[PDB]
Amino acid sequence: LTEEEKQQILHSEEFLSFFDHSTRIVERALSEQINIKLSLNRQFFDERWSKHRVVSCLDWSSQYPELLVASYNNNEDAPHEPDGVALVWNMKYKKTTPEYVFHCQSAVMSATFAKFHPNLVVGGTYSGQIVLWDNRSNKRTPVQRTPLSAAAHTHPVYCVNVVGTQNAHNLISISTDGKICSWSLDMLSHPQDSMELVHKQSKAVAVTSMSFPVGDVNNFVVGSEEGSVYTACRHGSKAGISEMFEGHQGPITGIHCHAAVGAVDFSHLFVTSSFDWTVKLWTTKNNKPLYSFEDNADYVYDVMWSPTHPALFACVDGMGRLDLWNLNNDTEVPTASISVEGNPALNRVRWTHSGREIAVGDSEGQIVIYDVGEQIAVPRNDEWARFGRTLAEI
Amino acid sequence: LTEEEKQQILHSEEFLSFFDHSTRIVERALSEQINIKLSLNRQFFDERWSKHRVVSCLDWSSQYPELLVASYNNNEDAPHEPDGVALVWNMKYKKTTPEYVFHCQSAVMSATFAKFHPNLVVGGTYSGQIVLWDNRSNKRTPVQRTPLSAAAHTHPVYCVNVVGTQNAHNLISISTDGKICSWSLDMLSHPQDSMELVHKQSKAVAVTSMSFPVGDVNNFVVGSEEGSVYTACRHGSKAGISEMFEGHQGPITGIHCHAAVGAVDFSHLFVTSSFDWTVKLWTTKNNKPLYSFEDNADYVYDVMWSPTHPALFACVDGMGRLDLWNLNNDTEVPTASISVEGNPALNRVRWTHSGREIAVGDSEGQIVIYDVGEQIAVPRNDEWARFGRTLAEI
Amino acid sequence: FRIFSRFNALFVRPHIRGAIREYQTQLIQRVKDDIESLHDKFKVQYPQSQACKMSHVRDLPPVSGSIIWAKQIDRQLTAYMKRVEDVLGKGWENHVEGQKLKQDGDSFRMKLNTQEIFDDWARKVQQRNLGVSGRIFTIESTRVRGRTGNVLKLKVNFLPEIITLSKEVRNLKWLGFRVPLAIVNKAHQANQLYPFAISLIESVRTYERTCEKVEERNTISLLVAGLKKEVQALIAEGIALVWESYKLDPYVQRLAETVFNFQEKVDDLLIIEEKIDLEVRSLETCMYDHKTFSEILNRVQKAVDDLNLHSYSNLPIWVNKLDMEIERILGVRLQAGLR
Amino acid sequence: FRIFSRFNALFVRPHIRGAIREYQTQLIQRVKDDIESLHDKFKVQYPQS
Amino acid sequence: EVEETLKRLQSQKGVQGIIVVNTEGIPIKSTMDNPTTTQYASLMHSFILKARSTVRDIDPQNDLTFLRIRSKKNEIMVAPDKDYFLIVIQNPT
Amino acid sequence: EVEETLKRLQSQKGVQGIIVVNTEGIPIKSTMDNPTTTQYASLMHSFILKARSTVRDIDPQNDLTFLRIRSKKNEIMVAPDKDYFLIVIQNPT
Structure with a gap:
C-alpha cells in the first residue's frame, strides 16, 4: 500500500527466487543485435534591432x-x-x-x-x-x-x-x-x-578583458587596455594584481585561458589578442611571451581557445577573415582560414561549449555561425602529448 | 467468416516490406535466449542453392x-x-x-x-x-x-x-x-x-582478371590467359597496353595489386597466381618477377593481399588447401596453412575488409570463412621496415 | 632443397660436398618418390580430373585445357630435373641411381608428349569442316510437341560452338603449335563476326518470347499489330541477305533496337491491359451508384488517354470493342438494378 | 619570413650566403611594394577607417 | 510467393506450425488443425491490438513491430507492421 | 544483495539501476519520473495479467518471465517472478 511495508518486504529473505530470475533474464538479455574544413553553417541577422549596431x-x-x-x-x-x-x-x-x-x-x-x-x-x-x-x-x-x-x-x-x-x-x-x-x-x-x-x-x-582559468575561481587573468596582461587573485590576503607582463605595445582586444582538461595540465596557458595583429600563446608562470604569431596589415579583435582541442584557437580579423590556428599542425600559417563576404571588421568569436561549432560576430550585426571540419575540430589522445612536445620545443 | 478476402490478399503480392522484415527478423529470432594460426569459424553450404555447384x-x-x-x-x-x-x-x-x-x-x-x-x-x-x-x-x-x-x-x-x-x-x-x-x-x-x-x-x-593500384584511379593492370601481365592506362595521354611483363609460363588466373598502406609506399607490388602453383610477386617498375612461390604444382587459382598486413597475403590451391603466405617471417615456407575437409577443389579466396578473417569458395559451393591468429593478424612499424628491407634483399 | 638453398658458398670447396654425397642416395630416392607421386596424379586423366571442369568454368576449351595441363606437368618435371642438377652438381647421371632417375624422367616425359592431341584435333577440325558461310539466318521445320501442326520455328544460321574453336586457336597460336592457314582464316573470321551473330540470336529469341507472350493474351495483338508488322518487315528485309556483307552492322543494330522497343512497348501495353481488365471486372460487381460508376469510367478513360498519348497503333477499334463490352456489362447491371 | 627563416643559420655557410638574396633581390623589391600596398591602408583612412 | 515463404519459415527451426496471416485476426489457414490455429490467432490479434494501444500510451507515434514471448513451455511470435501478424509455435529452448 | 543487483542492472545499456513493480502497479523501487513510470507500470500490469489469462486459456501450466516489447525508439523488458515485475528500458542497439 503505502511506502513503508515495501521496505520490510524488501528486507525479507524470500528474494532468492527473485534474484535468480533477475540474473537469468539479464544474462539472457545481454546479447544485443541490430534489426537491419570551414563552412557557413547558419546565419542570424535581425533587422528591427540589428540595423548597424555592431556585435559586442x-x-x-x-x-x-x-x-x-x-x-x-x-x-x-x-x-x-x-x-x-x-x-x-x-x-x-x-x-x-x-x-x-x-x-x-x-x-x-x-x-x-x-x-x-x-x-x-x-x-x-x-x-x-x-x-x-x-x-x-x-x-x-x-x-x-x-x-x-x-x-x-x-x-x-x-x-x-x-x-x-x-x-x-x-x-x-x-x-x-x-x-x-x-x-x-x-x-x-x-x-x-x-x-x-x-x-x-x-x-x-x-x-x-578577462578570463578565469577552468576550475579556479580564486585567481584569474586580465587583459588591460594598456597592452599589459596581469594575473589577479579574487579572494585572499593578496587580492588584486599579482603579475606584471611586458605583453604587447598595443591595447589588448581579447583574452582567454586554456579551455581543456583530461591530460597533462595546460591551465597555465592562455592567449591574448592584441591590437596589432599579435596573438600570444603564452603561460602564466613565465613572464616572456612564448610565441608572437604575426601577419596581416590589419589586426585581431578576439581569440577563443577550443573547448575540446588543447591546441586549436580561433582568430578574428578586421578584414573579415576568420582563421583557426592549430599549433600541433603548424605554428606559422593559419591551419584554417576563410574570409566572410563583404570584408567587414569582425568583432568577436565564441566557440560552442561542444567545441564542434564556432560563432563569429560582425560589423553590421549579421552573426555568422560557422561549422568546422571533423578532423580539425576533435583532438586525439596523442594530441595532448603533441601539444606538450610543441611547447617544450621552445 | 471470410473465405476469399484472405485468399485474394494472399494472392495479391504486397509482401515486399512484409517478407523483407520477416526474413531480417526471423534469423534474429534464431537466437536461443531461453531462461531454462588458423581455425574454422563459419562454414556455409546452401543445400538449395549450392548442391554440386562451383563458386564463381x-x-x-x-x-x-x-x-x-x-x-x-x-x-x-x-x-x-x-x-x-x-x-x-x-x-x-x-x-x-x-x-x-x-x-x-x-x-x-x-x-x-x-x-x-x-x-x-x-x-x-x-x-x-x-x-x-x-x-x-x-x-x-x-x-x-x-x-x-x-x-x-x-x-x-x-x-x-x-x-x-x-x-x-x-x-x-x-x-x-x-x-x-x-x-x-x-x-x-x-x-x-x-x-x-x-x-x-x-x-x-x-x-x-585485372586490378588497380589502391588509392589511385586509372592506370590499370591486367593478366592474360596467354601467360602475360600487362600495365594499361585507362585514359591517360594514351589508352591501351603500356607495359609488357616477362610474366609466367602458364595462364594467368588471378592478379592483384598491393593494398596495405602505411608509413611506406608499396602500392606498386603485384601478385599473380598462375596455373602452375607459382604465385609470383613483382613490382610495376621492374620487368622481371621478383620472387617465386614453389612448393607443389598444378593450379593455385587465386591470391589476394591482406588489406591490413603489408607483407602477408593468401593464396588457395585447386587441390584443396589454402595457405597464408607471409613475406616478413618466411620466404620459402607458408606462415599458415589449412585444408578444407573432403579435400575439395577450393576455387576463390577473398580477404574481408580490415582483414582478421578470410573467405574461401569451393567447387562444391561450401564457402568457408575463418579468422587468423592475432599474433600474425596485426602488423607493426617493424613489419613495414623489415618488409622494405626484404625488398632490398634482391 | 630449401635447407641447401640457405647455404651455397663453399660448394666449390670439396669439403661440404662430402656431406651432400653422403645423403645423395636419400636425395635421389626421395626425388624419385616425388616424381612417382606426380606421375600417379598425371595418370588421373584430364577429363577425370576436376582441373578439366575448373578450366571449363575458366573459359578454357577441353582440348586446349588438356594440352596446357600436360605442358605444365612437363614444365614441373623439367624444373625438378634442373633443380636436382643444380643442388647435387654436374653429372649426377653418372651414378647408377642418377642414370636410373634420368631414364625414369625421360620415359615419363615421352609418355607425357602433347603434339599428338594437337594433330588429332586439327585433323578432326579439317574432317568436320566447320563454317558459317550461308544465309543470315535459317528458317526450318519442326513439329513441336503439343501441337499437331508443323511449327516453322525461326533460328539463326550460326552454330554457337564455332567461337569455341576460335578460342582453341586463340589459345593454341601462342602455345607454339602452328595450325593450317585455312583454320586460322576460319577462326579469325568467326571471331570477328561473332558479335553480330550473337546479337541476332538474342534479338530473335527475345522477339519470339515476347510475341508468344503477346499471343498468350489475344486481347492485345490487335493493338500490337503495327509493331509486329514493322518487325516482320525488318526481318523480311534482313533474310534476303547472304551471311557475309557490309550492311550487316547497321541492319543488326536497327533490328536489335527495334526488337527492344517492341518488347518494352509490349510489356507496358500488357501491364496497362491487366489494369484495365481488373478495373472492368471490379465494375462488373461494383455496387449500384452513380458516383462509383463514374469514377471507374473516369479512371478507364484516363488509362485510354494515356495509351493514346503514347501513340500506339490501332486504338479506335480496340476502344470500340472495349466500349461494347462495358456497355454490355452496364446493361446487365442496369437489369439487376431495375429488377 | 618563414621561407628564409628556414635557413637562418644556413646562410652563415660560405656558399649558402651567395646562394641566397643574390637571386632574390627582385623579390625584395616585390616585398617593398607589398609594403607600399601596406601603407595604402594608411594613406586615406584617418577619420573613416 | 506463398509456399516457399511458409516452407522457409517452418524448416528454419522445424517449427510445429506457421500460417500466413495478412488480415486482422480470424485466419482461415491451418497448419495442424483449424481450431487451435484460428481461435488462437484471433486471440493473439486482440492482444496485439491492446499491446499497440499500450505502446501508444507512452507516445502515440510509437508502434510495435516485433513481439515474442518465450515462456516455460511455449515461444510465441508475431511481427505486426500494418496487417502482417506472425504466429510461431515452438519449444521454449 | 539489492545494491549488487542495482549495479548489475545499471551496467546494461540505457538502464538506470533497477526498478521493480509490485502487483498494485506502484513500483517498489524509484529510478525514473514517478507519474510516468506509475501509469506505464499500471498499464504493463494490466496487459501482463490479461496475457497471463491469454496463455492459461490454452497453457494452464505455464509461467511468464520473458516478453520483448520493442519499438523503433526503445525496448521494455518485462519479467514477473510471482509478485515482483522487473521493467527495464534498453536501447535496441
Whole structure:
C-alpha cells in the first residue's frame, strides 16, 4: 500500500527466487543485435534591432548548449530607436527572428548567461550598470538593475561572468576603471563584495578583458587596455594584481585561458589578442611571451581557445577573415582560414561549449555561425602529448 | 467468416516490406535466449542453392562489412532450373539459409558490390551482359541489363569493379575478348567508355582478371590467359597496353595489386597466381618477377593481399588447401596453412575488409570463412621496415 | 632443397660436398618418390580430373585445357630435373641411381608428349569442316510437341560452338603449335563476326518470347499489330541477305533496337491491359451508384488517354470493342438494378 | 619570413650566403611594394577607417 | 510467393506450425488443425491490438513491430507492421 | 544483495539501476519520473495479467518471465517472478 511495508518486504529473505530470475533474464538479455574544413553553417541577422549596431559580445548557455546571447551596442542611426539591445539565438530550429529580444536604456556592451538561473540573462552596458533580464517576465525592460553609485561600477562595463558551483555562486564583473565586483545572482541591489584593481601603489589598471582559468575561481587573468596582461587573485590576503607582463605595445582586444582538461595540465596557458595583429600563446608562470604569431596589415579583435582541442584557437580579423590556428599542425600559417563576404571588421568569436561549432560576430550585426571540419575540430589522445612536445620545443 | 478476402490478399503480392522484415527478423529470432594460426569459424553450404555447384566469384561489402556476394555458373544437375545463381550471405547472426538470392538467365561469372551505392550489386555473366540487382527490393529478376552489342561486351565477362569515390564513381568492366568498358551506376544501358585493349600489331589480350593500384584511379593492370601481365592506362595521354611483363609460363588466373598502406609506399607490388602453383610477386617498375612461390604444382587459382598486413597475403590451391603466405617471417615456407575437409577443389579466396578473417569458395559451393591468429593478424612499424628491407634483399 | 638453398658458398670447396654425397642416395630416392607421386596424379586423366571442369568454368576449351595441363606437368618435371642438377652438381647421371632417375624422367616425359592431341584435333577440325558461310539466318521445320501442326520455328544460321574453336586457336597460336592457314582464316573470321551473330540470336529469341507472350493474351495483338508488322518487315528485309556483307552492322543494330522497343512497348501495353481488365471486372460487381460508376469510367478513360498519348497503333477499334463490352456489362447491371 | 627563416643559420655557410638574396633581390623589391600596398591602408583612412 | 515463404519459415527451426496471416485476426489457414490455429490467432490479434494501444500510451507515434514471448513451455511470435501478424509455435529452448 | 543487483542492472545499456513493480502497479523501487513510470507500470500490469489469462486459456501450466516489447525508439523488458515485475528500458542497439 503505502511506502513503508515495501521496505520490510524488501528486507525479507524470500528474494532468492527473485534474484535468480533477475540474473537469468539479464544474462539472457545481454546479447544485443541490430534489426537491419570551414563552412557557413547558419546565419542570424535581425533587422528591427540589428540595423548597424555592431556585435559586442557572444556566449553560449552551459545548461542549454543551443542558446547564444548577442549584444548589439551602438545606436547612431536613430536616437529614438532603442539604445541597447540583446538578442538570444536558438540552435535547435532555424528562424529569421530572434527567439527572445531584450532592450536596455543604455547601450549593452557585454552579456552572458547565468549559471545558477538557466532562465536568466545578465549583461553589462556602457553606462556601467549590471543589467538583468528575467526571461520568465514578459517585459523587455531590465528586471533588476545595479545602482550607478561609487559602491558599484560607474565606467563602461565590458566583462561579466558568473562562476562557482550551483550551491555557491558569484557574479564577477570588471569595468574599464578596474573595480572588480562580485554580486549574488539573486540580489544585486548592493555589491556584496568589490575592490579596485590597482598595480604597484597608485597605478590604476585600464581593464578591457578577462578570463578565469577552468576550475579556479580564486585567481584569474586580465587583459588591460594598456597592452599589459596581469594575473589577479579574487579572494585572499593578496587580492588584486599579482603579475606584471611586458605583453604587447598595443591595447589588448581579447583574452582567454586554456579551455581543456583530461591530460597533462595546460591551465597555465592562455592567449591574448592584441591590437596589432599579435596573438600570444603564452603561460602564466613565465613572464616572456612564448610565441608572437604575426601577419596581416590589419589586426585581431578576439581569440577563443577550443573547448575540446588543447591546441586549436580561433582568430578574428578586421578584414573579415576568420582563421583557426592549430599549433600541433603548424605554428606559422593559419591551419584554417576563410574570409566572410563583404570584408567587414569582425568583432568577436565564441566557440560552442561542444567545441564542434564556432560563432563569429560582425560589423553590421549579421552573426555568422560557422561549422568546422571533423578532423580539425576533435583532438586525439596523442594530441595532448603533441601539444606538450610543441611547447617544450621552445 | 471470410473465405476469399484472405485468399485474394494472399494472392495479391504486397509482401515486399512484409517478407523483407520477416526474413531480417526471423534469423534474429534464431537466437536461443531461453531462461531454462588458423581455425574454422563459419562454414556455409546452401543445400538449395549450392548442391554440386562451383563458386564463381567472391566479394565483401566495404560499406557493410558483413555482406558477401557469391556467384555460380549454369548447373549441370538441372538446366531447367535457374542457371545463374547469385547469393548474398550475412554476418549478423548464425544461420544456414542465405540472406539473399538472385537469378540471372545466363551463367554468372563474377559479381561485386557497388562503391557508389551501398545496396546495388553488379555482376558479369557468361554471355558478356552486365547484370544489376537491387538488394533492398525483393526481386529475383535482374534490375538492369546492359545491351548485348558489338560496342558493348559480348564475350564472357570475368572482372567488374567500381573505381573512384562516391561522387566520382565509374564502373569498369573487362571482357575476355579484351574490351574495357566504363559505365555509370545510374544507367546501365550504354557504355560511357568502350575500347578494345591491344598490345601490338592490333592483336588483343585475352584478359582473365585485372586490378588497380589502391588509392589511385586509372592506370590499370591486367593478366592474360596467354601467360602475360600487362600495365594499361585507362585514359591517360594514351589508352591501351603500356607495359609488357616477362610474366609466367602458364595462364594467368588471378592478379592483384598491393593494398596495405602505411608509413611506406608499396602500392606498386603485384601478385599473380598462375596455373602452375607459382604465385609470383613483382613490382610495376621492374620487368622481371621478383620472387617465386614453389612448393607443389598444378593450379593455385587465386591470391589476394591482406588489406591490413603489408607483407602477408593468401593464396588457395585447386587441390584443396589454402595457405597464408607471409613475406616478413618466411620466404620459402607458408606462415599458415589449412585444408578444407573432403579435400575439395577450393576455387576463390577473398580477404574481408580490415582483414582478421578470410573467405574461401569451393567447387562444391561450401564457402568457408575463418579468422587468423592475432599474433600474425596485426602488423607493426617493424613489419613495414623489415618488409622494405626484404625488398632490398634482391 | 630449401635447407641447401640457405647455404651455397663453399660448394666449390670439396669439403661440404662430402656431406651432400653422403645423403645423395636419400636425395635421389626421395626425388624419385616425388616424381612417382606426380606421375600417379598425371595418370588421373584430364577429363577425370576436376582441373578439366575448373578450366571449363575458366573459359578454357577441353582440348586446349588438356594440352596446357600436360605442358605444365612437363614444365614441373623439367624444373625438378634442373633443380636436382643444380643442388647435387654436374653429372649426377653418372651414378647408377642418377642414370636410373634420368631414364625414369625421360620415359615419363615421352609418355607425357602433347603434339599428338594437337594433330588429332586439327585433323578432326579439317574432317568436320566447320563454317558459317550461308544465309543470315535459317528458317526450318519442326513439329513441336503439343501441337499437331508443323511449327516453322525461326533460328539463326550460326552454330554457337564455332567461337569455341576460335578460342582453341586463340589459345593454341601462342602455345607454339602452328595450325593450317585455312583454320586460322576460319577462326579469325568467326571471331570477328561473332558479335553480330550473337546479337541476332538474342534479338530473335527475345522477339519470339515476347510475341508468344503477346499471343498468350489475344486481347492485345490487335493493338500490337503495327509493331509486329514493322518487325516482320525488318526481318523480311534482313533474310534476303547472304551471311557475309557490309550492311550487316547497321541492319543488326536497327533490328536489335527495334526488337527492344517492341518488347518494352509490349510489356507496358500488357501491364496497362491487366489494369484495365481488373478495373472492368471490379465494375462488373461494383455496387449500384452513380458516383462509383463514374469514377471507374473516369479512371478507364484516363488509362485510354494515356495509351493514346503514347501513340500506339490501332486504338479506335480496340476502344470500340472495349466500349461494347462495358456497355454490355452496364446493361446487365442496369437489369439487376431495375429488377 | 618563414621561407628564409628556414635557413637562418644556413646562410652563415660560405656558399649558402651567395646562394641566397643574390637571386632574390627582385623579390625584395616585390616585398617593398607589398609594403607600399601596406601603407595604402594608411594613406586615406584617418577619420573613416 | 506463398509456399516457399511458409516452407522457409517452418524448416528454419522445424517449427510445429506457421500460417500466413495478412488480415486482422480470424485466419482461415491451418497448419495442424483449424481450431487451435484460428481461435488462437484471433486471440493473439486482440492482444496485439491492446499491446499497440499500450505502446501508444507512452507516445502515440510509437508502434510495435516485433513481439515474442518465450515462456516455460511455449515461444510465441508475431511481427505486426500494418496487417502482417506472425504466429510461431515452438519449444521454449 | 539489492545494491549488487542495482549495479548489475545499471551496467546494461540505457538502464538506470533497477526498478521493480509490485502487483498494485506502484513500483517498489524509484529510478525514473514517478507519474510516468506509475501509469506505464499500471498499464504493463494490466496487459501482463490479461496475457497471463491469454496463455492459461490454452497453457494452464505455464509461467511468464520473458516478453520483448520493442519499438523503433526503445525496448521494455518485462519479467514477473510471482509478485515482483522487473521493467527495464534498453536501447535496441
